[PDB]
Amino acid sequence: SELLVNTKSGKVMGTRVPVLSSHISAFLGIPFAEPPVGNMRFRRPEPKKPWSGVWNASTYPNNCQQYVDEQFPGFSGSEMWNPNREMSEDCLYLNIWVPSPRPKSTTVMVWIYGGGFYSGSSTLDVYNGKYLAYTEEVVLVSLSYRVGAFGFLALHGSQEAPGNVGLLDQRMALQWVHDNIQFFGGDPKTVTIFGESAGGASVGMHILSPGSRDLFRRAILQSGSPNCPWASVSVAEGRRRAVELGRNLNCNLNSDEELIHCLREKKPQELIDVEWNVLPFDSIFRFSFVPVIDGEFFPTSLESMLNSGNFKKTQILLGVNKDEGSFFLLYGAPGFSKDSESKISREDFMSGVKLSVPHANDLGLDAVTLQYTDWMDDNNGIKNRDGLDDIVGDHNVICPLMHFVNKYTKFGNGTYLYFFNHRASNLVWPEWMGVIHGYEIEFVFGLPLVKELNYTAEEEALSRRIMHYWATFAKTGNPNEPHSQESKWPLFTTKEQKFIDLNTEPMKVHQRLRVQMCVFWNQFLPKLLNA
Amino acid sequence: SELLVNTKSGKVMGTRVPVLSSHISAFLGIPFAEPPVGNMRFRRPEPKKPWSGVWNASTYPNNCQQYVDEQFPGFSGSEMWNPNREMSEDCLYLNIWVPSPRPKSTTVMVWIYGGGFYSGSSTLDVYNGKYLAYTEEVVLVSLSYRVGAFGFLALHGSQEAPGNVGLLDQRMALQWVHDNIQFFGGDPKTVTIFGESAGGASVGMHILSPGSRDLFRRAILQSGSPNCPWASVSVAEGRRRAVELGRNLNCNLNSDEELIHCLREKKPQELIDVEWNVLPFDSIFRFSFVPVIDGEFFPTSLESMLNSGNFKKTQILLGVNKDEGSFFLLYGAPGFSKDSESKISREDFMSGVKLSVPHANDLGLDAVTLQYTDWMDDNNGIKNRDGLDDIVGDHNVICPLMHFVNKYTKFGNGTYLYFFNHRASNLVWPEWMGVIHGYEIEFVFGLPLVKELNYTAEEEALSRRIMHYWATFAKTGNPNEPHSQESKWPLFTTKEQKFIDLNTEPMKVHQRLRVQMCVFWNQFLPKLLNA
Ligand code: IUM
Ligand code: IUM
Ligand code: IUM
Ligand code: IUM
Description:
Chains A, B: This is Acetylcholinesterase. Chain A has helices spanning 76-79, 130-136, 148-152, 165-180, 198-208, 210-213, 235-248, 256-265, 268-274, 302-308, 326-332, 346-356, 362-372, 381-409, 441-444, 457-476, 515-530, and strands at 4-7, 10-13, 15-18, 23-31, 54-56, 93-98, 106-112, 139-142, 186-196, 218-222, 233-234, 292-293, 316-321, 415-420, 498-502, 509-511.
């Protein structure tokens, strides 16, 4: 009865939400898994037992236990990413926005949030699917997955904490969407999983995981890809970090059973408190509990998989932001402050490049510095600052994504590559951080469309193009409307390597995104480090 | 009696030569050493026994046995460097051009010719000191030194063929100049040794050799420096190449005495014929018999010496040509022909970079290619062609010279650095080779001044500036006339690193010649190869 949806798990009662002019149906906090609490912490998600009665899908679910950024308390720029609902280990819930009237079988977009696998909520203001569902008439799903140690602790042997359990959370949401989105008017045969940062890395990992390929049609990857250096550890390093996490909580680490038991008794916040102490390196843009290359979720190494074509072959739309690195530099690298044009000294640059590339020897750090220093001007604080952003952005998202694009396009049924380089007019972060990691999201979710948000008209325009690019790609596997007034977004071929700018200036097409630098990061530096 | 000069070695009768308007005295083929023939092949030069009677110093001496370029027979571009007098092992002679009337004590410039230590003559048209002596009123000396195996065969143990013997030839000419230039009107207290290519490398080596520092005042180094990768071998490699030279002539190489004896019986041309077979590498811009870092001439390694300040501390004027590499690419690297715009394929580029950097492993070759490829355009034949020239020019002359400038300026009494980037209007070589190795020489020696040579007026202008820069530097240790209408040639400091363009456009000052690339060649690639 519009808001009464009767699903294979039970009846779900949603709520009308106002969006722009109209209203839309919203179903919020649908459980898709049994609460991963108690003896079930670190365990694989268990499918949600069906409920008697109607489920009140009208309020946002608990967010999952996660690190809370208090680096800039009150600063909307950082709080916009913080959990906005009560945190709870009970948090495996998804959110669905459906048009009014209910479509019959229309496209589904399943948003998977980023947050470096230690943070993230489906429920943040910038992930509100109102605007996207309304504007583009897509059923929009937000999912939830366990982040941090709760989702990615990996004692590879044990059944009680294998890794990737937070990815399995995602996969179960995807199963539920596959099984039940039809009752919300969604077409399970065309669900598109999009995500940003670790969310896009996750999307890439379901393209890769055999166990996930059947559960979605298409994929959008924003500023992340499965092969990103921060997105996976070996099972050995996962074990190492799991044990070190237990060492921090004074766990008896005689056996996996002993460790897991200890970690299961700790309050969620104590895991969170010591979580960053288990990194093996003084480092930027590294997270403690990330997916493990474990043999089950990933059959082998991601590189083999990308090489063999061992991945779901579909269409992907993906891309990066211009200044991917600045966010992590501000937070982690000396000399970058929020309130200064963060001109970076030479001493702080070398501190920064050493933090950015923690796995690199003195030779590798020299290679990086050679690549990224303006040697005509090696003490220019701006060039050092921007160069650090470039190092961090190229090493950590742009070049791994371009590696992934190249390897994937060899076997996929279509690749669209954007380069988002628009600084929002109302961006609350300093100018020096540029087009920041994560700040294409508000444009994907249509926030320039709400006038109270103080976007320019030109930005609202861009948001409508992006949403239209995104939903058209989701519907059709091509972001372009067939024969439209807009100019066409070229396919990315391994031949021409074309890609588009996304900003308010009209579309420009380019070749070979950061190729000079990505040849360094993808081809040369690894060869150098192995030698 | 103008042309009758009575020297410590005996009387010398020269000849009036017409130069531009006037005439000048010329003394040609003064012997400064005993003919290094017979049992004296490969031996240290022996000082010339004084002669009875007058020495006819009116014709050019024999040139020294050397490889003769027949790659482009008749092509003036290549024949201008070939021996133009009868070749002979008897060839240790110097040439003096004196003004008319005879000055009393005026500056001396001692030209040391290049030719990669395997070739060179004092007597080539482009080394005619008429124009420089006339125009700038300097006594101008050309010397001769044994090149190739005859000057640089190095069986380190033996007294009968230690290396560097061709450098000792140079040092003896310098002694003779020190002892006798006064009788030609020259001031031994201010002789300036200049040289180009291996000639400038040689000049650098007398700055370094304790045994030579006292014999000259100032130094000009054109497109060469003692630390150039092609300018010295270890004594071990010298022995290796000496033995391999003997292996090619079917010498009994049981003992040094046996080898040297065999090499002493061979006709000069048989040494020359097999000379290039002893290189250890398929290589460009490597010569077989070069100076040996032997403990006597050089006390230790050149790098230690440059580091410790263990060198003659004076003023040096030095610099490089823009397109230093093209000459060797045309001759040695596949895909470069004289008569085509030598657009270089990718297969021929990698062949070229492998030839340019023969001592480098696959990792180093990758590093070079990373540095020098336009990855937006890696198949552009022009960019590949020019890039090869840059690789060869940077690796082989520009970056070692900049290393030498930097190390030297720490301790020297003044450094002037030019960058010659003028392509002669009448250059007979193809356009693609650019400002070619060696083609600033005609400007230093004032050939744009003879109208029959078809230089532009603007080029004659440049030649007069260069000659004036050169002789003023020789006279004064500063190329600048004190308070003149010309703009001042900045000192090269390690602080600002300033240097001037030399061309017909008016002087421009720049910083940090090819620093991005020289940081690669001087700092990074060696660190990479040692690892
Ligand atoms: O709680 U237990 O292996
Ligand atoms: O990292 U930025 O132009
Ligand atoms: O001719 U003998 O040692
Ligand atoms: O070797 U050049 O421009």
